[PDB]
Write an enzyme that holds these catalytic residues in place. Structure first.
Site, PDB file in Angstrom:
ATOM      1  N   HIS B  41     -34.498 -21.608  73.526  1.00  0.00           N
ATOM      2  CA  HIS B  41     -35.572 -21.366  72.805  1.00  0.00           C
ATOM      3  C   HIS B  41     -36.957 -21.451  73.489  1.00  0.00           C
ATOM      4  CE1 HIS B  41     -37.065 -25.407  71.945  1.00  0.00           C
ATOM      5  NE2 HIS B  41     -35.778 -25.907  71.648  1.00  0.00           N
ATOM      6  N   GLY B 134     -41.940 -31.695  72.615  1.00  0.00           N
ATOM      7  CA  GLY B 134     -41.805 -31.772  74.056  1.00  0.00           C
ATOM      8  C   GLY B 134     -40.522 -32.421  74.465  1.00  0.00           C
ATOM      9  N   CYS B 136     -37.491 -31.359  73.852  1.00  0.00           N
ATOM     10  CA  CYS B 136     -36.300 -30.728  73.954  1.00  0.00           C
ATOM     11  C   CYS B 136     -35.842 -30.568  75.238  1.00  0.00           C
ATOM     12  CB  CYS B 136     -36.854 -29.271  73.327  1.00  0.00           C
ATOM     13  SG  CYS B 136     -37.990 -29.453  71.925  1.00  0.00           S
TER      14      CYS B 136
HETATM   15  C1  LIG Z   1     -42.501 -34.543  61.443  1.00  0.00           C
HETATM   16  N1  LIG Z   1     -43.512 -34.030  62.368  1.00  0.00           N
HETATM   17  C2  LIG Z   1     -44.836 -34.059  61.664  1.00  0.00           C
HETATM   18  C3  LIG Z   1     -43.434 -34.881  63.296  1.00  0.00           C
HETATM   19  C4  LIG Z   1     -42.436 -34.817  64.497  1.00  0.00           C
HETATM   20  O1  LIG Z   1     -42.728 -33.569  64.946  1.00  0.00           O
HETATM   21  C5  LIG Z   1     -41.664 -32.982  65.644  1.00  0.00           C
HETATM   22  C6  LIG Z   1     -41.945 -31.594  65.964  1.00  0.00           C
HETATM   23  C7  LIG Z   1     -41.049 -30.846  66.606  1.00  0.00           C
HETATM   24  C8  LIG Z   1     -39.808 -31.685  67.417  1.00  0.00           C
HETATM   25  C9  LIG Z   1     -38.951 -30.822  68.279  1.00  0.00           C
HETATM   26  N2  LIG Z   1     -38.908 -29.253  68.261  1.00  0.00           N
HETATM   27  C10 LIG Z   1     -38.492 -28.627  67.472  1.00  0.00           C
HETATM   28  O2  LIG Z   1     -38.163 -28.742  66.520  1.00  0.00           O
HETATM   29  C11 LIG Z   1     -38.907 -27.002  68.101  1.00  0.00           C
HETATM   30  C12 LIG Z   1     -38.070 -26.095  67.261  1.00  0.00           C
HETATM   31  C13 LIG Z   1     -38.355 -25.387  66.348  1.00  0.00           C
HETATM   32  C14 LIG Z   1     -37.553 -24.297  65.557  1.00  0.00           C
HETATM   33  C15 LIG Z   1     -36.413 -24.103  66.194  1.00  0.00           C
HETATM   34  C16 LIG Z   1     -36.056 -24.943  67.293  1.00  0.00           C
HETATM   35 CL1  LIG Z   1     -34.541 -24.775  68.049  1.00  0.00          CL
HETATM   36  C17 LIG Z   1     -36.935 -25.869  67.943  1.00  0.00           C
HETATM   37  C18 LIG Z   1     -37.946 -31.633  68.727  1.00  0.00           C
HETATM   38  N3  LIG Z   1     -37.673 -32.787  68.618  1.00  0.00           N
HETATM   39  C19 LIG Z   1     -38.790 -33.566  67.847  1.00  0.00           C
HETATM   40  C20 LIG Z   1     -39.580 -33.014  67.269  1.00  0.00           C
HETATM   41  C21 LIG Z   1     -40.585 -33.600  66.387  1.00  0.00           C
END
Ligand SMILES: CN(C)CCOc1ccc2c(NC(=O)Cc3cccc(Cl)c3)cncc2c1
Ligand SMILES: CN(C)CCOc1ccc2c(NC(=O)Cc3cccc(Cl)c3)cncc2c1
Ligand SMILES: [Cl-]
Lengths: 300, 296
Positions: B41, B134, B136
């Site tokens: 991704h 970040g 990932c």
């Molecule tokens: C709940 N939020 C307000 C705070 C935390 O924010 C997050 C936000 C993103 C996070 C993240 N990344 C993705 O999910 C990106 C993405 C989007 C759609 C598909 C795929 Cl395969 C990948 C990884 N790990 C943690 C993440 C915590």
């Protein structure tokens, strides 16, 4: 999202771990530049431990009595000196893996990572805190002496603890890297017991702010409290007194969540009175005190 | 004495972490030999990838820029061929783990390791991690002797705050897809063999209040366990618990009767190893390793 007990990556410390042998005793040493630091009780036998005279024992030793092993290589000891409860072994080779480092003495409530070692080989890493009674609740077996505690803020390793002994209750005692013990302990097999332990109040409040940042608000209430009334209640549950310094330190988390420190102190008083009622906070059924305000800001 | 959630030393993995940038997206990569592995991704993935050229992928190892000389996709992982082999590449294997198995996570941001924690692959295939945007490309691993077994690569966070990812061959753990769509973790269950291992660890550490004179059949235990959303206990699990049973003198089905009484009656204001909940993120092997001091 999520909240875990997180340790610092241990790589910079692994490249410093060595094995130190003196007679029948084998433990771990920390090899920084051309010096290996280890507990001075490595010069002792189990008979000597009741009332050791370390100065008398050390003067009788020669450099070739100390066997230092870094991986599969034997290091040559070219000198030695004792600084408080730590032995400093001068070696003929500087550690090429020596990171940027500092020796720091921490206060109770402060957290750090422990790289538990046996025979100069790292076996695991965990996160812990210096208890108010100066002990650490570690996970250590015989041979772990010389294992170190550290923090890695930026690219600099701050060494804050060196393991020396296990007390009768299963808790651990040790020194800073200058050989000064944390707490009223001595490197002697004599009647020693940890004082009554208390909960690190400023750390529980930081963890309650972490729970709010992660979306959990069930424990909040409409009440506030004076600092004195909070301390009068907190003392009854064996919680450490909360000082104005702690209130100041919690300022950033208070500004971020919109919950005043004394307002959060009122939720804590209510939690102590009521219990959790089958609920959890950040996946825990107990109030967690091993995350500092600094750890909460760093992780969240 | 003492029992902590302990991770493997992360040094061999730290020397493999790199930063990967593609357009506006920046995440972490795993640099082994002359290949950098990262979530696909970062870029219809085969249509998106054909449009990319090698110079679009900016790879940074510390303060050095690595040159991408090729690329291919394997399931949900992108493999970036680089012109320089990692001199810090450890002895390694790619392994796919089962639910209930534990591993260490080296959480990274911008190719820089920030922390290490220990966790378990939940029965619903999610991990209860600690990750921000970040993270990932951060990896999960175990160490056997001097060999690093890479078992997980972080891809995303689900709406409930739990995490999903793949093995190092790009196959997701669980029924998840790497895209923005409505996805939810299924109902989770407790890892029974792991709770029993942690009860044996409590006995080894002097905590015996929960022991009782009773025993149970495996069938009766499973009938009770299925009621509390506990995973079924198999004869393989009973066999795996054999060494801990022999060391403590407590038969696995005798420890099951203790667990049954704990589920029906609760802890009664008491704790086990400093916890008011039954812990399921220590495997039987983790308990033996920590209570014996195996090194790496
Ligand atoms: C709940 N939020 C307000 C705070 C935390 O924010 C997050 C936000 C993103 C996070 C993240 N990344 C993705 O999910 C990106 C993405 C989007 C759609 C598909 C795929 Cl395969 C990948 C990884 N790990 C943690 C993440 C915590
Ligand atoms: C028997 N049961 C309690 C298992 C655990 O046994 C242990 C046994 C020893 C442990 C240890 N070592 C010492 O304490 C050695 C020592 C003795 C007196 C004074 C000093 Cl300064 C040093 C360290 N850390 C953990 C240790 C767990
Ligand atoms: Cl401090």
């Amino acid at each position: 999202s999520g909240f875990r007990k997180m340790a610092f990556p241990s790589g910079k410390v692994e490249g410093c771990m060595v094995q130190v042998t003196c007679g029948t005793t084998t433990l771990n040493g920390l090899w920084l530049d051309d010096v290996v630091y280890c507990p001075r009780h490595v010069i002792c036998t189990s008979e000597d431990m009741l009332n050791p005279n370390y100065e008398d024992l050390l003067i009788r030793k020669s450099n070739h009595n100390f066997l230092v092993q870094a991986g599969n290589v034997q290091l040559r000891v070219i000198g030695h000196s004792m600084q408080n409860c730590v032995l400093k072994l001068k070696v003929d080779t500087a550690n090429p893996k020596t990171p940027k480092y500092k020796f720091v003495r921490i206060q109770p409530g402060q957290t750090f990572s422990v790289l538990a070692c046996y025979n100069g080989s790292p076996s695991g890493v965990y996160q812990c805190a210096m208890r108010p009674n100066f002990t650490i609740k570690g996970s250590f077996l015989n041979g772990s002496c010389g294992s170190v505690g550290f923090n890695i803020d930026y690219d600099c390793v701050s060494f804050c603890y060196m393991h020396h002994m296990e007390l009768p209750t299963g808790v651990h005692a040790g020194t800073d890297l200058e050989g000064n013990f944390y707490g009223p302990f001595v490197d002697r097999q004599t009647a020693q017991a940890a004082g009554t332990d208390t909960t690190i109040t400023v750390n529980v409040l930081a963890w309650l702010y972490a729970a709010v940042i992660n979306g959990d608000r069930w424990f909040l209430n409409r009440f506030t409290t004076t600092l004195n009334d909070f301390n009068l209640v907190a003392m009854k549950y064996n919680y450490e007194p909360l000082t104005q310094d702690h209130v100041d330190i919690l300022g950033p988390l208070s500004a971020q969540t919109g919950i005043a420190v004394l307002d959060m102190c009122a939720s804590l008083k209510e939690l102590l009175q009521n219990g959790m009622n089958g609920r959890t906070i950040l996946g825990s059924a107990l109030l967690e005190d091993e995350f500092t305000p600094f750890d909460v800001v760093r992780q969240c």
